[model samples]
Target: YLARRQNWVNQLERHAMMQPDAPALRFVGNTMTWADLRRRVAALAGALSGRGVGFGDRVMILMLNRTEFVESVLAANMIGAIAVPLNFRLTPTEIAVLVEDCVAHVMLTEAALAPVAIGVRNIQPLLSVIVVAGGSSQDSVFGYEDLLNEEPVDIPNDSPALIMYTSGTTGRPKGAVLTHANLTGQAMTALYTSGANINSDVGFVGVPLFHIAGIGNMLTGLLLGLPTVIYPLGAFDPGQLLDVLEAEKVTGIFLVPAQWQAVCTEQQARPRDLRLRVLSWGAAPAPDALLRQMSATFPETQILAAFGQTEMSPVTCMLLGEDAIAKRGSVGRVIPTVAARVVDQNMNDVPVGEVGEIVYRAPTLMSCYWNNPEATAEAFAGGWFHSGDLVRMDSDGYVWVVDRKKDMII
Candidate 1:
C-alpha cells in the first residue's frame, strides 16, 4: 500500500487512516476495527515503553488464541521490541528454559497463565515483570488492558520485530530474529498465493498463534485489508468448524491437513453453505486420497500446499492449485524472492533428479539464532541458511522432497 515500502505498523496505520471503521480482527464474536486496533496498539506500545522495554528487547507472549495475542505482538513491534509468542502447552519449567535462554525481561500473559509466568520468573530470577491480561492486578504483576491508554511509538522497517523460537528437542530453543522487512516480503508474496482482493475477502486463522503458519496467514490477510476471523482455542470439532465457516463466510482458510480431512468428511456427511475461496494446507503433506477429497469437497476453492519452516519466514515454497494434483507429492517450486538449491554433503550443487540437502538465501530468512553464534554460523556455513530437507529438483523445476533428513531413521 505504500509507494516505497512499509512494515506491519505502517500498513496498520494506512488502513486506520483510510478505513478506520473497517473490521481488522474477529475473535470470540467481537471485532476490532482498524482505527481502534491501531489506537490500542499505540497505547500498548506506550505502556511497554513506560516499563523500559525498548529497541531489540524480547517480550514473551504466553496466552491463548485471542485478540490480545495479536494486539500484544503489534504493541511490542511498535516500540521496536521483539515479540516472542511462546507455546503455552509447555509447562512452567519448560517455559523457564526459553525465558532464561532468550534473556527476556518481560512476559505478557493471561490470568490463567500467570502461575506459569511466575514460576518461570522464579527460575530466571532476572525476569523483570509479568503483565496479566484478565485477572486482579497485583502489586508486582501489571494489568494488560490498563496499558492501552498510554502514548504510542513507531519503529523502522529494518528493525528486528520478532524472535520466533524453534522447538528445541536437545536443549533450550533457539530464537530466530526476524525483521520487519522479512515480514513485509512475506506479505507481498502471499498476496499472490492467497489471491485475496483488498478489502473484499475474509481469512480464517485456526492454527495456533505460536506457529509461523498461523501468524503468517493472519499478517498476509491484514496487509491486504482482509478481516481475519480467529477460531476459538480447543480441540478440533469438524461440525463446529463447519458451522463457523458458514456463518463467517470466510473466503480464505489455512488449516493443517488433518483438519482439512475432517472438514471434508463432515461436508460429505451433510452439505453446508460456505464461501471459502482460498483453501490451503501445510505443516505436513496430505496423502493423495485426502488431497483429492479436499479438492472434491471444495470444488470452487484454490488448493495450495505451503512448505517451509520458522527460519524462512515460514513459506519458501508452495504447490499451487492444480499443480498439487499434477505433481502430487512435490512441495512445488521455490517462492519468488527466495533462492534455493539442492546441494550434496560437500556443499556441491546436486544435478537434477539427485537427492541433496536444501539450502536457501533470502531477505525473508531470519537474521540468526539469538545468542547462539556457533549454531548460527553452522546454519549459514556456505552463505546460505541450510534447510534439513532432502529433496530433488526435476527438469520441470518442481521440488520433490524425499524426506526430512532430521526425521529419517538411522
Candidate 2:
C-alpha cells in the first residue's frame, strides 16, 4: 500500500521494483517490461534535462495514441516538467492557441503532424519542435530517437507532472494543473475501483492520448504493471477494433460510449472471440439503448459507466456491472476517497432526488487551472469543485444525472 503523499514517479519505481520483468506496455506489437519502461522514462528525463526542460517548464506533445506519447509523458513526470498533450485532430490555428496560451517551450510531435507543428511555429516563433517516428526537413525539427540515446536522470516526486487543457466549453481553453501526487491518487483509486489484475490481464487502450481518458488509462496500466495494447485508430471503428481485440487477446478495455456502440453493433452482426473481462466506458454518457445492447452482447463481461472531468483526475463516480443496467442513465455513486453532493443555487444540499449541481471533493482533484486564477476560483466555489452538471441522489446513495446546469433551457 502506498502513502497518501506518494508521488507518481515513486509509484512507478515501486511497481517496477516489485515486478521488474513484468510486462508494462505492449504497443504496436512491441512489448516493454516494467524495468524497460522505467529505464526509458529515466533516459527521456535526462534528455529533457539536457534540452533545458526542468521543473515548471511546459513540454507539449502532439501525437496520436502511440507508445511514444506514453513514454514522453512518463519521461516528463520523471523530470518535474509539465506535459501539455495536444489533440492530433486540432487544426494548426487551434494548436497555436493552446501552444501560445501555455507558452510551451518544447514540443514533441509525430512525423505525420510535422506540418501542423510547423504551421503552429509560423504563429509562435519562440517554440522548439521535435519530430518522432519520421524526420522533418525543417531546421528546428529533431528526431525523437536522438533523445533516447541520452543518459538517464533521477527525478523526484512533487514535480509538475502533467498540464492538460480544458475543452473550452465556456471560452478559450485553460490548463488544468496535475501533479505527480494527483496522478498517483488516480491510479490507486482506479486499482481499487476496477479491481484490475496486473499480473495476468491485458489493457486495450483505444482513447486518444490528448484526452484525460487516454492519459489516465495509460497511467493506470503502468501502476498495475499490466501490458497495454495500443490501437491507434483515430476514430471509433467497430470492424478494425474487433480485429485488434482478437489479435491482441485483449482482456480489459476503456472506451467511450460511441466506441461501445460500434463494438456492440458489430458483435450483433458477426460474432468473434472476445476475452474481455471488464469493459469500462466514460468521457461521455452512454445512451440507454447502447447500454442495453452491451449487456446483451457481453453477458459475461463487466460493463461499467463512469463519470468525471479533467478537473477531478477524470473519474469521480462509477456504475459497475449490473448496477450500470439497473440504474440506467445514472453515473452511479461517488468513488471511494471522494465526497460528493447535489447542491441548489444557494450551495445548500438539495432534498433526495432533487436535481441540482453535482459537486465533488477529492485528493484526486487537479491542483488548479494553470495560470488562470479566475477560472480556478470559479471552479472551487462553495468549497466544492462544481461539476456544472445537474444530478439527483436517491436515499440509497445512487446518483442520477439529469442535465447540465449551464445547458438548462430556461
Candidate 3:
C-alpha cells in the first residue's frame, strides 16, 4: 500500500507545485487555481478524517454540478473513503434505498438538496449531513465552510475511489467499485485517443458531474493539466452552450448527438468563433445524417464517437474523425489499451458479421460489483468481464452494436 503515486490527489498536488497560478477548474464566472483547489481538497480531507471517516468508508454526495462537487469527491478519496454520488432526480425514498445499501455515514450536499438529505437522515439517523452551500437550518447538520479548518492526511493509491451504481433497468442497481488505478487507466486511454494539445487545449464538461461521462472527461483534463470549464446544470439551450464554448475558447468537448444537432443548427444560424479541436459524442447512437451534419458544422474540428459502459471506467472503443463517415454506425475499433472478444454463450469467438456479446479485459475494468458476489461472478463469467452488449465486428475491426444481451434474453 505504501507504493502510492498517480492518484488524482497526487496529481493535483503535482500541478499545484509546478503551476500554482494556473487555472484548474472553471464554473459560471469563477475560476479556481490549482493551488486553491488542492488546499480546499486537503482541508476537506482533513475534516473528513477528523469526523472519523476512514478507509473503506462511503461518503454520499448529493448536489448539482459545481466546484464543490469536485472538491467533495477528491476529499473523500483523499481520506481513502469512497464517494457515492446520488442522482439529483431521485426522490427521498429512492435516495433512502441507496443510503441503506451504501451505509454512508456522511453526505455532502448543497442548499437545494438539504431537505432531501435531511429526509434521508431522518430515515438513517446515524448518517451525518454536511451542507456545502448554505441551508444549514437544522442543528443536526454540519456546515461546509466550518469544516475547512483542518490539515491534510495520506492514503494508498490502489484504494477504491467511487461506488458508482449501475442503472437498475431490470432490478436493483448494483454498485461498481472503481479503483484509483481504474481511473488512471481511463485517463491514459483518453490521453492517447483524444489527441489533445496538453499545453494549450481547454476542455468543457457538457454533462452532469455525477455521471461518469462528466467526471471521466474531467479526469482526462486533469491528466493533461488542462483547464476544464464546467457548464452549470439547467435547461438545454444550444445557443447558450455555443456562447460558452466561444467565450471559454474550449478546444475539446463531449456531448450527445441530440445536443450536437441543436448546436449545429444554432451555429449555422449565428456562427461563433469556436476554438474546438475535438468534438466527441456518445451515450446513444447517432444517425448518419446527424454525423454528417456534425462534420460540416465543425469543419476544422475532429469529430469522435466514444463507446463503453460505467464498469470499464467507461471507454473501450473510440471512432475518431477520420472514420466517422465511412464507419458511420460503428462504435469505432476496440481501443488499444483494452482486450475484447465478440463471443457466443460458450465463449467461443463468433464469425465476423455474426452478432455476439462483446466481453472485455482491461486495466480500466472495475474490480467488482460492490458487495454483490453473485452479480460479480455472473458478470465475470469465463474469466472475462461481460459487457452484455450484442455487437458484430466488420472486416476492418469496427464494432457495430446490434442490441443488448439482457434485453434479448428478456
Candidate 4:
C-alpha cells in the first residue's frame, strides 16, 4: 500500500507560485512575501546541502522568535533533514547532552547565543556552526547571509520532519519524532475548530517558535496561504501586543491563560481597535472567572482551548467557542482526527464516568521516541500511544482531565 505523500515545503512552493506577492510572514520591521520566503528557503537549503547535511541528518537550531528561526527549520526540512530546535534558555552543558544524543553535525544559531552554540561545539567536536546575525571571524564559523548566495537547491521527503524533546513527568527529556503527516493532521484540526478565514485573517503568534504551539500556528498560516505575524520575544507586554494586534488587524491568536488575563485587563482600561475573530489559549488551565472575562472583553470573538502534549502534534482535544465556560473544567471533546479511548492499566476501556488513562491512535501521533527503543516500546505497549493523562469523559463526549498516572511519581 502506498501512503499519500505531502509536505509543507511543497505546499509553500505552491503558495509562492500562486500568491507570490502575498505576505507570508510579518515581523516588527519587515514582512516577507511568499516568493521571497521560498527563494530564501531554497538558497539556505542549498547551503545546508553543500556543508554535507543530507537526508535524515540532524540540524539543530537555537534562536529567538524571529523570521530566521522559521526559515532555518524549513530550510533543514527542504533538504530532507530533521530539524531539532533547542530552547535557547538551556545551559551549554544541558545542550551538550542533546547534541550528543542526536549526534547533530550542524547547528544554526543567532549572534546573541553564539557562545552557547560554540560551547556545545567545543564539548562535542566536528560540529559545524552558522551564525545568523553577526558573522564570526573564526575560520570554521560561517555567515548566514553569505551562505544564501548559493544557487537554489530544493530537495524534499520526510517521513520525521522534527525531533522535539519533551519535558516528561519522569526523568530526562526524550526526543519525540513527529512526521509530516502528523503536522498535516494538526493543520486540519486548526482549520475546522478555529473557523479561520484564509483570505483575510492574520494569525498573531505570541508563543516562541521553538515550542509546538508557535510552530503549529505558523503551519496553519503556511497551509492556508495566510500571513502570520511573529511576535517579538522579550518581556511580555500586553499593551505592546495589543498595539500590534490593532495595527496588524490580527484575526486569530493563541496565548497562555496568564497572558490572556493581562490582555483582558489592559483591553478594558485602554481599548484598541482590534479585529480579532478567533481567540485561543492552552498549556495551562483557564479558570471560569478568566473565561467570563475573555467573553466580556471580546464578546464577538470565538474562544477556543486546546489540550494535548507534543507527542500528538500537540492537539487532541479542544474546548470550542461558548463551551469554554459552559463545559467548565473539561478539555472538550476529542478531535475527529484522533481515535481516543479512556482505559485502565489492563487495556480495558473504562466506563464513561470513570477516571482512566487516555490512549490515542491518530495520524497526528508521533512515530516514536528517537533512539530509545525501550521507551518507545513502553509508550506503545498496548498498540496505542499512552498519553499518561488521567481523564474522564462525560456522556456528551467531553473529556475532563483530572490527574497524571502515578508512574510519574518516580
Give each model's whole-structure lDDT.
0.82, 0.77, 0.83, 0.83
lDDT of 4 by residue, 125-184 (tens): 857655554564466678887888753333423468998876542556689888887787
The RMSD (Cα, Å) of candidate 4 is 3.3
Ordering by TM-score: 3, 1, 4, 2
CA shift of 39, model 1, Å: 2.1
Which pairs of residues collide in model 3? Answer: none
Off by over 4 Å in 2: 1-8, 11-21, 129-131, 136-138, 150-157, 268-270, 283-293, 311-313, 404-410
Runs of candidate 3 with Cα error greater than 4 angstroms are: 1-4, 149-154, 404-410
Q: After TM-score superposition, what is the CA distance of residue 67 in candidate 4 from its true location, in Å?
A: 0.5
Instruction: Write the residue-wise lDDT of candidate 3 on 73-103 in tens digits.
Output: 9889888899998888887777777888778
RMSDs, each prediction? 2.5, 3.5, 2.9, 3.3
lDDT of 1 by residue, 271-375 (tens): 789998888887677888998898899897888877875644458888997787788889999988889989988889988789999899988888888899998
lDDT of 2 at 134: 55
Model 3 score (lDDT): 0.83
Deviation (Å) of 338 in candidate 4: 1.0
**Candidate 1 TM-score over all chains jointly:** 0.94
Question: What digit string (tens of lDDT, one per residue) describes model 2 on residues 106-128?
Answer: 88888888888888888887577
